Design a protein around this ligand. Structure first.
Ligand SMILES: [Mg+2]
Ligand code: NA
Ligand code: NA
Length: 326
DNA sequence: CGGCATACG
DNA sequence: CGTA
DNA sequence: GCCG
């Protein structure tokens, strides 16, 4: 009965199989570090299936028939239920390769291919990277400079403060423009490692050129540590009592015709959105992105006024943001 | 066997 | 490549 | 790794 696509089932923020899903997500992460995006996707999908189950899995029998559970994912669950630990997962956890690849890829500006090159060159610590600044892009230098702050959870109080300063800059840049919180906080998370805002204006076209004006106004108030269009992946200098901390903020501008598509895309989760786009193309023959939904045979775009419109057109039961935690 | 989301900076 |  |  469990549907095969994550966009076909509700996934709440709090679920009953954290231990099993976290183990499968270790194996997914490790598959990514070794360049196997297909194995990463399967282990991610299997972990997500467990998040959608109504009760704890306590016996191997309860996996029968579940999508994305084959011999490998089932054996991991089996060893966790029988023994409380999966040897493969523990081997990965404790490996120098996994630990270093995790350390490096958590840096803003560094992905798997960069981290892997540095690993092969013998680098192992953040200090090692700092010792060779020539090997770093400007983005990576900013990621490393602010790494301690960026590893500190962002809280709702930070979000609310950031939304106010973004709203102030947006309103100074374009009267009538709006700011919508997206990302994990819109899904109900109480913490995050960044904050996402989606900006539009109710009159189509008025938002042209808006994001550079917003960034200038934020930079003039001393709020920007790093940036650099319609998407800006920033590091903000967020005031705190007596001080400040760096926070990752993403700002996105969309024309209002695209707003429901951008809201859907930027609200996530990442797996939910990959699965939704896969479902759209493979099951419905329609092409989905954060700008629109395209019928390639009629050569037309679907006009949506809400996220609900997008789900209904795809033949999917609507899921509110707090049920998209795939 | 081959696919695996789909953009922008 | 990196970001989402 | 799993599945169409
Ligand atoms: Mg973000
Ligand atoms: Na990174
Ligand atoms: Na986010």
């Amino acid at each position: 009965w469990m549907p095969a696509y994550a966009c076909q089932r509700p996934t709440p923020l709090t679920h009953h199989n954290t231990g099993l899903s976290e183990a499968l997500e270790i194996l997914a992460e490790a598959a990514g570090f070794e360049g196997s995006e297909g194995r990463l996707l399967t282990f991610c999908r299997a972990a997500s299936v467990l998040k959608a189950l109504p009760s704890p899995v306590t016996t191997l029998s309860q996996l029968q028939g579940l999508p994305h559970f084959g011999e490998h994912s089932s054996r991991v669950v089996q060893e966790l239920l029988e023994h409380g630990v999966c040897e493969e997962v523990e081997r990965v956890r404790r490996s120098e390769r996994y630990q270093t690849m995790k350390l490096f890829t958590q840096i803003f500006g560094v992905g798997v291919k960069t981290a892997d090159r540095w690993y092969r060159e013998g680098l192992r610590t953040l200090d090692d990277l700092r010792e060779q600044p020539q090997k770093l892009t400007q983005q990576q230098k900013a990621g490393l400079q602010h790494h301690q702050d960026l590893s500190t959870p962002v809280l709702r109080s930070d979000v609310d403060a950031l939304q106010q300063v973004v709203e102030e800059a947006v309103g100074q840049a374009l009267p009538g423009a709006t700011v919508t919180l997206t990302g994990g906080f819109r899904r109900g998370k109480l913490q995050g490692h960044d904050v996402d805002f989606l900006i539009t204006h109710p009159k189509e076209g008025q938002e042209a050129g808006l994001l550079p004006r917003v960034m200038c106004r934020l930079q003039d108030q001393g709020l920007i540590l790093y940036h650099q269009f319609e998407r800006s992946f920033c590091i903000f200098r967020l005031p705190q009592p007596g001080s400040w901390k760096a926070v990752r903020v993403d700002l996105v501008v969309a024309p209002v015709s695209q707003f429901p598509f951008a809201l859907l895309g930027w609200t996530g989760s990442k797996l939910f959105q990959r699965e939704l786009r896969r479902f759209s193309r493979k099951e419905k023959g329609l092409w989905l992105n954060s700008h629109g939904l395209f019928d390639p045979e009629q050569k037309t775009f679907f006009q949506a006024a809400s996220e609900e419109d997008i789900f209904r057109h795809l033949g999917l039961e609507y899921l509110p943001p707090e049920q998209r935690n795939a």
